[PDB]
Each structure stands twice: as structure tokens, then as C-alpha cells.
A paper describes a structure:
Here we report the discovery of a natural protein, citrate synthase from the cyanobacterium Synechococcus elongatus, which self-assembles into Sierpiński triangles. Bacterial citrate synthase (CS) proteins are homo-oligomeric enzymes that can assemble into dimers and hexamers. CS catalyses the condensation of acetyl-CoA and oxaloacetate to citrate as the first step in the tricarboxylic acid cycle. Using cryo-electron microscopy, we reveal how the fractal assembles from a hexameric building block.
We were led in this direction because fractal complexes are pH sensitive. Indeed, an increase in the pH from 7.5 to 9 led to complete disassembly of the structure into hexamers. This behaviour is driven by the residue H369 in the fractal interface, and changing it to arginine abolished the pH sensitivity without compromising its assembly into fractals. Instead, we solved this structure for a point mutant (H369R), which we generated in the course of a structure–function analysis (described further below). This protein also forms 18mers at levels that are indistinguishable from wild-type SeCS at 50 nM. Moreover, it is capable of forming the larger assemblies.
Numbering used by the authors:
A (entry chain Q): 5 to 112, 118 to 219, 313 to 375
B (entry chain C): 5 to 112, 118 to 219, 314 to 376
C (entry chain D): 9 to 113, 118 to 219, 313 to 377
D (entry chain H): 133 to 197
The structure:
């Protein structure tokens, strides 16, 4: 008989998607070094690679980009629900409440193809709307003649940025979008095995997520004009690709997780009034 | 499966020696309560009870006491070797070393009756002797007139006491002679389990060993004994218990044998230096 | 009856699986560890838990080599024993009263292990010679562990090949899991003591399979026929010391309980 | 200097060291105290540092003799 405290060194599944070696430094998403990706690529490229399993042509990329550009705007009942929160909460409580209630509204082959589109589109709008409403003012609407990183930074600032900062923010979003098994990813994989929809899974993963890279991360963020409190929620968009990757293939093996225990306490007693 | 930390609450042995009960205040030395035994009895008359198992007559009592008093003496080889001991070490380590150096001189069906008279007559001489030899003197030698406790006090302080103090000390000794199973008695049991002599048993027990105290401290300080000597005294009495349990483990011969549960590494390679 | 199949601790040091034939010392099977490893390196493994660099092996070897000599009051206390007492009695007295001299009680975790590993074989070799009629022989300063021990015991320094046979037959024994000696070491050490006492009690209770290959390989090298069990203790102290350090972070205590079958409420008269 | 060195050792548990018969005054003393044989340069230096202390005129100790 053996034992394993805190569940260490134990295999849990058979991945394919990312590899790190750590003897010289080899970090690759699906089999490509990190610098070939970080010099001449854009975010939707990386995310199509991660999710779907290959690289796209010209047609399919232009179609994905237009579709994601059509679904960027929030409805009016949802703003009418946000208006009543207290103005003393946090951003992670706002994020769990909104991501959870967005599954009341639309839920029921396209099934796998649309949910990914809405989740990729509407998150940064919600983050920015509550940033404004927390202060007395109104929400700002989205433009239709901009691109992902610059559009988000405008909705937060109401000042239109020059292309250099847009490109820099975009690749700093490229180099965070994946890593291998840790707490949050095991929690998404535990939840998603009872055959559920992506809104509960992301609700639960963002429930448990709440020199090193941190030095320069802090500085290059502080200069672009982003408040302090909004540090960590900026993470959770960069990463929302990783988690969806997993939901797709853990839905293939139809098992359920359940270990057992080693009872260690007082035995056979009797009911004393 | 199951697991208990500290064997805490697992039955280990059978017994017929003592009984305790703590919701009402009951404590029995073979079924004769503590009050009517501390009212008109002495240490030797009890000790016969615990070890052998039934109240004695008068003829045997005379024989017993006469014999445990014609053997209080020692040779010059033990005293000559006692001198080569340091003079800045605790008296407890000297107790252990001397109890384990009795074994060389005396060793190898009246064999379980000689051992008791020897290990019961020959403790006080030696603890007092080291008390004197530590700070530069010569040790006293006992006369054939005084009693057990009277003679201990005379050897320790050189000036005779009055009889009332002797009587009080004899009570103080017949209180501390037994209780239920503890750490030290557990050590003596697991070491006797494989048929070895009584001396080794007493050395390992003393090694393990290093309300009522709140007043015993006072009663001892009054009579003129230092602080360094509060613990060896509490050992003199107690031997009369360890002995008894040795005597018991000899009827069944079955040797203690538990197991473990691992949680370490498995399969590795010796990497060259 | 007799504590069978009952889980007493959680440990990590040695693993043995019977029915399929295996044995490991911290995760490395034994037949791979015998052919390219010496003794002191194996003690270092079984104590701290990680094989060492080059400089650390060097400093351990030197530190051991400087602590083999033995002051003159200890010699002068050994001369009074009698010439008719067993050798295991000499070993209990010696290892128990070596704790009167050096007891301060990781500035006090790394000296004790050094002296305990240094000054045992000297004592067993001396009392051999003193019991016989003549006085002890000092240690050299140009040999290695098993060569030095064999020269102190017999005076005629051996061939290197015999040294190496001795050294691997000294690593074959250093470890094995729960038994009566080891359980008594832990029971003693649970109350937070220092080593010179737990070793005294553990050598108190020790007093074709491999009881046919030991006999002969021992009898050829030139070893008397009574020092058979004491030489075994030289091999085993390593094992025991690991335990005193593992069981010092749990802090609990031992206390099992008993059942009763005796008569109650009798009537007192001392004169029976 | 034999007496001074013998008590320096016995004060510590060990034994006294004996003298050699193939050395000179300052180096011999320094060996009996160290058990490590010294090179001639330090021997000569110690010797002349012993030369320049061996006399002075009337003070307490000399009046007492």
C-alpha cells in the first residue's frame, strides 16, 4: 500500500497542446518556437492555432475576423442590470456575476462554433463598462473602424491611440496566452467532465484564479495609462483562449473524477443527550 | 483503510495489576483501595503485594526485610571507577551509566528472586554517592540500625533526622509507586519482549524518563534536598512498578511487529559526479 | 495479539516489495548502488537525502579523518572493567557514558553525527586488546576506513582487495525497515532527547538465506568468533541516526491503552 | 619550555608530546607546541625577537630577586 500527499507527480490526462522542457528554455504552443510566433503574428492567429488544431488560409482568417467584429456590442437589459450593483464591490465579483448571468440569456455543430465567438467578443466591453459606471458617468460605445487592442484601449480612455502602442500591447498579449497544468486549469477540467456549457466552466475558473516577468509587466503597463485595480482582470482575457482549448478535448473522454480517502478519527460512540 | 496517529486509543496488552477510573476517583493496587493501604502499611509490604501477588504473612516478612539490608554494600572496584566521572554533568546521565554498569559484575530457578533484592537494595547508595563525589568529598557508609527512608536521609545529609520525618517520607514514597501504562512502561515492555535480563530494562527505562507537584515541591524542599535532585528521587519509588511488568511479559512469548506506509520516490539513476 | 498489521508512522526512507523481489535505499535499487559507491557517500544519502557535489564529499571525508583519536580519561576508565564480562555489555556502558563528556544541549546537529560516526570502532578494538592482556594500538593516518579498522584489530595491514570486499559487505546491511530494534529507537526518541541515549537503548534490545555467506567471508578475513554481533552494530548506526532526525519534526508522543481482567473491592489485612 | 608546553596540552584532554633530538631551540619549542615542523625563516625570526628582550635594569622584579 502506498500514498501521495497533495496529489503530486501523478499523471492526470494525455495532453497535446503545449510543451516546456526547462533545461535550456523551450516553450512552444502546438510545436513552434515562441519567437517565430512573437515577431510576425497577431492575436487571432495564435488563438485559431490553439483552439482548432492547425493554421488557417486567407479566406478563413478574414471570415473569422469579420464575424468577431460584428458581435462586440452589449444589449440594453444587461446595462439595466449592471446599473444596480453597489459602487463598492470589486472587479472579480463583477466578473463572476456577469459571466454567470450571461448564460440565462442565450443557452440551450453551430453549438460549438458560436459560444466561442460570444465569449471572445463581449468580455472587454463588460470590464470597461463597469469601470466607468463605478464613477458616476456613462458607458462609452464601440467604434467600427478600429482593431482589437486599440479599440479596447479607446473604450477605456476616450482618446484614440497611435499604431505603435497598439502593436506593442498586442504582442504583450501574445506572450501570456498558455501554460500547462496548474490549479485553475485542473478546476476547469474537473467542472467540464459532467458535460456542461462554457459559461459555468469559465465562472468557476475565474472563481479560483482570484528578474521575473513581473518587473517589466508592471512598468510597461503603468505607462500606457491603465489603473492599478485593473491589473489582474487584464490577465483574464489574454488567457481565455487556453481554457477553451481544454473544454474541447476533455469533452471527448467521457470519464468522471472521484478519488477516495483514508478515514482518521474517533470511532464507535453512543448518543449522550 | 484506516490510520491512527500515536497508536492513540489502540489496545495493546492485557493486565491484572492496577485499575483506574477518573469520573469518580478510583485507583486500585490489585483490588484494595489506596486509603486503607496508605493508612497502616509500608513500602516493602506493598512491594511484596504488587510483584508477587497476595498479602504476606509475618515469617516471610521478617525474612524479606532482613535480607534487603544485609545487602546494601558494594565493592571498591565500583567506587574506584565512580571517581573517573566528570564533575559538570547532570546526575541523571550518571544514574543511567551506573545502572548499566552493574551488569558486568553480576550476570548469568531462584534467579527471579535474587534480582529483585539486588535492584531494590542498591539504588539509593549510588545516587547519594554521586551527590557527594561531584563536589569533592568522600561518600558515607551505612549503619545496621536505621530504616529505609531514615537511612537514605542520613547518608545524604550526615545528620540524623527525627522519627516523624521518617514516617512522612515513607508515605511520600508509597504514593508514587504505580499508575497505568505510560511512555516509560511502554519502553520497558517492548524491550523485555525478547527475553533479556532486568538490568538492561532498567537502563532503557531511565533513559526514556528524562495537583500533586504543587505541594510535593514544598514538602521536599523543607527536608533539605537541592533542586538538581527532584527528578532522581521520583525514580527510586518508581522502579517497584517497572519490575512488575517485566515479570508479566514472560508468560506469553510473542514479539511486537507493526508496519508503515510510504510516500517517497520510485525508480531513479545514479548520476556520475 | 502482538501488534500485527497495524500503521504506526508515515516514512520515506526505504522501500521493499517481497513477492516480486526488490529493495531500495531512497529510490535506487541496491545492485546498482553496490558497484560504484563507497560507504560515507551512502551514509550522506541516508541522512540528508541528496547525493552531494565534489567539495562536500571532500570536506566530510576530512572531518571524519580528524576525529578518530581518544582522550586519556576514557582509556583510564576502561581499565577497571572485569575480565569476565560479555562484549555487548561493554558496548552499552561505553556508548552511554560517552554522553557525560560532550553534551551541550545546525550548530548542534552536525557535530554529534561526526563523533558518533568516528569513535565506535576504536572502542570495540581497544576492549578486545585490553581484555586479552595487552594495551591498545593507536590509529594510523594514511589508510582508509576498513583498512584502518583491520590494522587496529590485527596489526598486519591487509591487501587492498580485502579492504574493498569488506567495504561492500559493510554497505550490504545499513538499512532495513520496521523491526524491534528500530521501534525501540523511535519510542525512546519521541520525547525529544539527544542521540547518545537512543543508541544506548537500541543496542540494549538487539542482544539458503544470508546465514551461510556471512559466516565464511567473515571467518577468512581473520575475525574472532565472538565479535560477530558487535561488528554488525558498526554497520547499522547509520540507519538509526536518520530516524532520530525525522521523528523530531512530528512532536507528538506515544501512549497506547490496556484492557482489564482483575478482581475488585477486597478487604484489607496486612498480616495475611 | 617543556613544562609550559606539557601543561598547555594536558589542559585540553590530550597527552604531552616528546622532544626531538635533531632540531634547535626555537624551532623545537614551536614544534612541541604545534606538532608541525617549521621552515628555517620563522625559526630565525623568533630567535632574534627573543634576543632583544633578555635584559633591562632595576625595576620591581629584579629588586625582589
Amino acid at each position: 500500500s502506498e500514498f501521495r500527499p497533495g496529489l503530486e507527480g501523478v499523471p492526470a490526462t494525455l495532453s497535446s497542446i503545449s510543451f516546456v522542457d526547462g533545461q535550456r528554455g523551450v516553450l512552444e504552443y502546438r510545436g513552434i518556437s515562441i519567437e517565430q510566433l512573437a515577431q510576425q503574428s497577431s492575436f487571432l492567429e495564435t488563438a485559431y492555432l490553439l483552439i482548432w488544431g492547425h493554421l488557417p488560409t486567407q479566406q478563413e482568417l478574414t471570415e473569422f475576423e469579420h464575424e468577431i467584429r460584428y458581435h462586440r456590442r452589449i444589449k440594453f437589459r444587461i446595462r439595466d442590470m449592471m446599473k444596480c450593483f453597489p459602487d463598492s464591490g470589486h472587479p472579480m465579483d463583477a466578473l463572476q456575476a456577469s459571466a454567470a448571468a450571461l448564460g440565462l440569456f442565450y443557452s440551450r455543430p453551430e453549438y460549438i462554433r458560436a459560444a466561442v465567438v460570444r465569449l471572445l467578443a463581449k468580455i472587454p466591453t463588460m470590464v470597461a463598462a463597469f469601470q466607468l459606471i463605478r464613477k458616476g458617468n456613462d458607458p462609452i460605445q464601440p467604434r467600427d473602424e478600429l482593431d482589437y487592442a486599440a479599440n479596447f484601449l479607446y473604450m477605456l480612455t476616450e482618446r484614440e491611440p497611435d499604431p505603435v502602442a497598439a502593436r506593442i500591447f498586442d504582442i504583450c498579449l501574445t506572450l501570456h496566452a498558455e501554460h500547462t497544468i496548474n490549479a485553475s486549469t485542473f478546476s476547469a477540467m474537473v467542472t467540464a467532465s459532467t458535460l456542461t456549457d462554457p459559461y459555468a466552466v469559465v465562472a468557476s475558473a475565474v472563481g479560483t484564479l482570484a528578474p521575473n516577468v513581473d518587473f517589466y509587466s508592471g512598468l510597461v503597463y503603468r505607462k500606457l495609462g491603465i489603473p492599478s485595480d485593473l491589473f489582474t482582470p487584464v490577465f483574464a482575457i489574454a488567457r481565455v483562449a487556453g481554457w477553451l482549448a481544454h473544454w474541447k478535448e476533455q469533452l471527448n473522454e467521457n470519464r468522471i473524477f472521484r478519488p477516495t480517502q483514508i478515514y482518521t478519527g474517533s470511532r464507535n460512540l453512543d448518543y449522550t443527550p
